[PDB]
Amino acid sequence: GSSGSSGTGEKPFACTWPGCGWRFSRSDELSRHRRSHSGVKPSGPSSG
Ligand SMILES: [Zn+2]
């Protein structure tokens, strides 16, 4: 719209995948995203 962002607006967690440019203010928010891409997962026979 018109009103921009001044109060909040900071995401240190930036995706590692190449070309991608998704950032998150929280870690979990970034980890859950990484899923979208194909990469070695910390899980194997089981995961929560
Ligand atoms: Zn990404």
From Swiss-Prot:
Tissue-level expression: Highly expressed in liver, skeletal muscle, and kidney. Expressed in cardiomyocytes. Expression is highly reduced in cardiac tissue of patients with non-ischemic cardiomyopathy and aortic aneurysm, and in glomerular disease. Not expressed in bone marrow or lymphoid tissues.
Coiled coil start-end: none
Zn finger limits (C2H2-type): 13-37
Localization terms from the record: Nucleus
Domain of life: Eukaryota
Entry's induction text: In podocytes, up-regulated by retinoic acid.
Function: Transcriptional regulator that binds to the GA element of the CLCNKA promoter. Binds to the KCNIP2 promoter and regulates KCNIP2 circadian expression in the heart. Is a repressor of CCN2 expression, involved in the control of cardiac fibrosis. It is also involved in the control of cardiac hypertrophy acting through the inhibition of MEF2A and GATA4. Involved in podocyte differentiation. Inhibits MYOCD activity. Is a negative regulator of TP53 acetylation. Inhibits NF-kappa-B activation through repression of EP300-dependent RELA acetylation.
Disorder association: KLF15 deficiency results in loss of rhythmic QT variation and abnormal heart repolarization. It may play a role in susceptibility to ventricular arrhythmias, and development of pathological cardiac hypertrophy leading to heart failure.
The record's note on its domains: The 9aaTAD motif is a transactivation domain present in a large number of yeast and animal transcription factors.
Subunit structure: Interacts with MYOCD and EP300.
Family designation: Belongs to the Sp1 C2H2-type zinc-finger protein family.
Name of this protein: Krueppel-like factor 15
Residues of the full protein shown: 346 to 380 of 416
